[PDB]
Structure 1
Amino acid sequence: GTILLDLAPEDKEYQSVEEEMQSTIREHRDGGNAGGIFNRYNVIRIQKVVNKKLRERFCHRQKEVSEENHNHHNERMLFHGSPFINAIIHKGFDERHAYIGGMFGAGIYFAENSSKSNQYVYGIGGGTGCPTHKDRSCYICHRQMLFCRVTLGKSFLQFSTIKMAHAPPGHHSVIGRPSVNGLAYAEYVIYRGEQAYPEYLITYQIMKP
């Protein structure tokens, strides 16, 4: 039931998304190992993901969370990267595919920094990089990430690794927060797929500095 609406680069909605993507790039602690060395993307395409059933599921859950959290669903626009974008835009996020070994356990991970999500596009820690050149810093091959609506509800703030299966009691999400001698950039984790909607599909390259 998914329809992808291609946005014209002249569209202000396209430009809004690209601006968020470009302006949230950060220098990463790993010197570029996972996601590559760049300070700018070349955006190839931005598509709006239209899926009535997925939207219904997302909205139903958002209403529940809102009622459970003093009428604040705390929706945030956040980036997601993984090798599973094609499945996500058709069937949604599915925590049954999330396993307990992750830094914050069996959840679906999002970032406020696009360059953090870019570290996951080819796998955890960038995997082995692009299929053709096996280069995590490939400047040739195309990449995709999502810019998603994410229902956070009441977030549990976590500063170090804790492998949990579900949000803590009374909460709807976990935020891995920067701390001294800890994380550098925030990571946002939900443990129910229906708390995210894959609003925008971005096709891009990283650019060589």
Structure 2
Amino acid sequence: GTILLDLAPEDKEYQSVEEEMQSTIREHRDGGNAGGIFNRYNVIRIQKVVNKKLRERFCHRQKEVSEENHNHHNERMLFHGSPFINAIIHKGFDERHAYIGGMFGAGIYFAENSSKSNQYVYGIGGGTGCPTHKDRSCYICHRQMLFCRVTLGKSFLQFSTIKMAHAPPGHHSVIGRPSLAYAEYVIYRGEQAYPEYLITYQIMKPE
């Protein structure tokens, strides 16, 4: 099955991830409502995720995309936030659990910003917050999110909202961009993301 490797805070890889996570915070048009109000994360733990059968599926699908797109699979590290991280680290992302209702349809949703994904950790628009306090802005309950390798191949740039079941013909990903507040990345096959890093953390209260 799946194996989680603890990264030590002195591991360069640990700081690499934290750095990405911390710096990619932005303030939102919420009032920080859904993800909660903060400027910084307390990172409790970071584990690297290792799963043979998942990696084999990811690697092969890259090949495919690489042929379809002039030998460049265009892999980017992006954050994912949702309630189903636990499923995801043993099984992998799975488009069968993605439905048409989403902002861009039956895709799996990522972000270049940590703080974007943190809005989705307890559901769409924060659902009813953390299990235990019903608080979108719990500064105590441990949150989880993922820092993934995503195979984008050839992205179809999108500006308004459109609902679609699959990637558009000739493309391998959608990107929804500004004029929308921050960048969103959407794939429509689970094998085009590998959950490389599991981050456990809390959001800190400003003074």
The TM-score bracket by the shorter chain reads over 0.9
Give the distance between the partners of 2:177 and 2:197, measured in 1 at CA: 25
Q: Give the Å deviation of 1:87.
A: 0.6
Compute the displacement of 1:198 (Å): 0.0
Percent identity, aligned pairs only, is 100
2:107 maps to which residue?
107
Q: How far, CA to CA, are the matches of 1:172 and 1:4 in structure 2? A: 29
Per-residue CA deviation, residues 147-202 of structure 1 (Å, 9 max, x unaligned), is 000000000111111110000110000001112xxx11000000000000000000
Matches of 2:16 and 2:37 in 1, distance apart?
A: 24
CA drift of 1:108 comes to 0.2
Root-mean-square deviation over aligned CA pairs = 0.5
Q: TM-score, normalised by structure 2?
A: 0.99
| CA distance in 1 between partners of 2:101 and 2:159 (Å) | 17
SS at match of 1:208: coil
Shift of 1:51: 0.3
Alignment equivalent of 1:203, drawn from 183, 200, 203: 200
TM-score normalised by structure 1 residue count: 0.98
State the partner residue of 1:163: 163
Residue 120 of structure 2 corresponds to 120
In the TM superposition, residue 29 of structure 1 has moved relative to its aligned partner by 0.9
Unaligned runs of 5+ in 2: none
Would you identify which runs of 4 or more consecutive aligned residues in structure 1 move more than 6 Å? none
Deviation at 1:10, TM superposition (A): 1.1
CA distance in 1, matches of 2:18, 2:45: 10
* CA positional deviation for 1:139: 0.2
CA distance in 2, matches of 1:52, 1:178: 37
Query: 1:36 offset after TM fit, Å?
Result: 0.3
Q: Which runs of 5+ in 1 are unaligned?
A: none
- Deviation, 1:40, is 0.1
Asked if 1:4 corresponds to 2:1, the answer is no
> 1:204 deviation in Å?
0.2
Report the 3-state secondary structure (helix = DSSP H, G, I; strand = E; otherwise coil) of the residue aligned with 2:55.
helix
In 2, Cα distance between the equivalents of 1:34 and 1:60? 37
1:2 to partner: Cα distance: 0.3
Deviations 1:19-45 (CA, angstroms, capped at 9, x unpaired) = 000000000111111100001000000
Superposition map of 1:14-163 within 5 A = 14-163=14-163
Tell me, yes or no, if structure 1 residue 192 matches structure 2 residue 189. yes
The offset of 1:98, in angstroms, is 0.3
Provide, for residues 65-113 of structure 1, a one-character-per-residue CA deviation record: whole Å limited to 9, x for no partner: 0110001100000000100001100010000000001110000000000
The count of corresponding residues between Structure 1 and Structure 2 is 206
